[PDB]
C-alpha cells in the first residue's frame, strides 16, 4: 500500500508540474520574435580542412584560445590541431581504441577522452621534456564514457552509459559527486557559463539540469520522442538546446521550466548528432546524419543556412569562443573550419 501510494503521489506531482508549466505559457517565442527582422541566408565557406584521422571522427572540442582544437577518432587517436595553419600540434595514441568523446581544458594544459573503456583519461600537454603522457585515469563508471567537460584543471564532469554523470577531483582521482536520475544512457552534457549548473541529455528522451556543488537534479525537461544525442547551453545560461534522433532540435528555457521552440523541417528525417550556438546565441548550428550541418534562426525557428561539405555523418561541431568560426567533424575522417 505504501509503494502504491508513492506511485500515485508521483503521478499527482507530475500532473502538478505540468499544470504549473501550462499556467506559465501565456505566449510563444515565435509570437515574441515575430517582429524582428530575419537573419537572411547565412552563407559560410570552408577556410581550413583538417586531414589526418584515418577513420570516423567522433568528437571535437575547441580550446579557449579559439585556435587550437582537439578531436577523437575511430583510429584510436586524439589530434590537437592548430586551426590557423592546419598543423598537427599533437598526435596522441590512446591506450583504448574505443574512444567516443574528448575535451579541451580551459587552460589548454590538459585534454581528456574516453569511451567503451569506461574510463576518463586526462592527458597532460606540458610535461618535463615536452611530451604527452597520461596524467590520470578516472575509473568508476560501470558504462561507457559518452562525454566529459573540464570545470578547471582539477575538476571534471563526465557522463556515462550507466545512466549517471559524475564530478571528479582530478588530483585524487575520486568521484566527488554522482548525478543519478536518468533512466537511460546519458549521451551529452553541457556546462553553464558560470559552471555551477550543467545540463545532460540521455536516451530516455529527457534532459536534466543539475547543480554541480549541491549534486542534485534541479529540473527535468521532456518533449523529445527519441534519444537526446547532443545538448548545448544558450550563451547567457538561462536556456539550452537539444538535438535528438527524432530529427528535431529543441530550445528549453530554465526559468519558464518548459520547451520554447522546435527546430524541424518536413524534409529532415535523420537524427541530430551535435548542437551549438553562435556567439550571440541568435544562430543554432546542428549536425545531422544526412552529412549536412543546418544553421537555424534560434529566435524565429527558420532554417537560415546549410554547411554541406562532408561525405558522411557530421558527428560533431563546435563554435569558437570568439565566434569567428565553426568546426565540423564527420564520419568521413575530416574536420572542416567554416565561416
Amino acid at each position: 500500500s505504501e509503494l502504491d501510494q508513492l506511485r500515485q503521489e508521483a503521478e499527482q506531482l507530475k500532473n502538478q508540474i505540468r499544470d504549473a508549466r501550462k499556467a506559465c505559457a501565456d505566449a510563444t517565442l515565435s509570437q515574441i520574435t515575430n517582429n524582428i527582422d530575419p537573419v537572411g541566408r547565412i552563407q559560410m565557406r570552408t577556410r581550413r580542412t583538417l586531414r589526418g584521422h584515418l577513420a570516423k571522427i567522433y568528437a571535437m572540442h575547441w580550446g579557449t584560445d579559439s585556435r587550437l582544437l582537439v578531436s577523437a577518432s575511430q583510429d584510436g587517436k586524439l589530434i590537437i590541431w592548430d586551426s590557423y595553419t592546419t598543423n598537427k600540434v599533437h598526435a596522441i595514441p590512446l591506450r583504448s581504441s574505443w574512444v567516443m568523446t574528448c575535451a579541451y581544458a580551459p587552460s589548454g594544459n590538459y585534454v581528456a577522452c574516453g569511451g567503451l573503456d569506461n574510463i576518463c583519461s586526462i592527458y597532460n600537454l606540458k610535461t618535463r621534456e615536452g611530451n604527452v603522457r597520461v596524467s590520470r585515469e578516472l575509473a568508476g563508471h560501470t558504462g561507457y564514457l559518452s562525454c566529459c567537460r573540464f570545470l578547471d584543471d582539477n575538476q571534471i564532469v563526465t557522463s556515462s552509459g550507466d545512466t549517471t554523470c559524475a564530478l571528479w577531483d582530478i588530483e585524487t582521482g575520486q568521484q566527488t559527486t554522482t548525478f543519478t536520475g536518468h533512466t537511460g544512457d546519458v549521451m551529452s552534457l553541457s556546462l553553464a557559463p558560470d559552471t555551477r549548473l550543467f545540463v545532460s541529455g540521455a536516451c530516455d528522451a529527457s534532459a536534466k539540469l543539475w547543480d554541480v556543488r549541491e549534486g542534485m537534479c534541479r529540473q527535468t525537461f521532456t518533449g523529445h520522442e527519441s534519444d537526446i544525442n547532443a545538448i548545448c547551453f544558450f550563451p547567457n545560461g538561462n536556456a539550452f538546446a537539444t538535438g535528438s534522433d527524432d530529427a528535431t532540435c529543441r530550445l528549453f528555457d530554465l526559468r519558464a521550466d518548459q520547451e520554447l521552440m522546435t527546430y524541424s523541417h518536413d524534409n529532415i528525417i535523420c537524427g541530430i548528432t551535435s548542437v551549438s550556438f553562435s556567439k550571440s546565441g541568435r544562430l543554432l548550428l546542428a549536425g545531422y546524419d544526412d552529412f549536412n550541418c543546418n544553421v537555424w534562426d534560434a529566435l524565429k525557428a527558420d532554417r537560415a543556412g546549410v554547411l554541406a561539405g562532408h561525405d558522411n555523418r557530421v558527428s560533431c561541431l563546435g563554435v569558437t569562443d570568439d565566434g569567428m568560426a565553426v568546426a565540423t567533424g564527420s564520419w568521413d575522417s575530416f574536420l572542416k573550419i567554416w565561416n
Binding site: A27, L29, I32, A256, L260, K279, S280, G323
Partner: peptide
C-alpha cells in the same frame, strides 16, 4: 520552484540576442 511567464523568458532571450548581435562574427 518559482517559474516565470514564457513571454518574459522569450523577451529576455531576444534582448540578449539583440544586445550581442554586433559581437557575433557569424551574424
Amino acid at each position: 520552484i518559482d517559474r516565470i511567464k514564457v513571454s518574459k523568458a522569450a523577451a529576455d532571450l531576444m534582448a540578449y540576442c539583440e544586445a550581442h548581435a554586433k559581437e557575433d562574427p557569424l551574424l
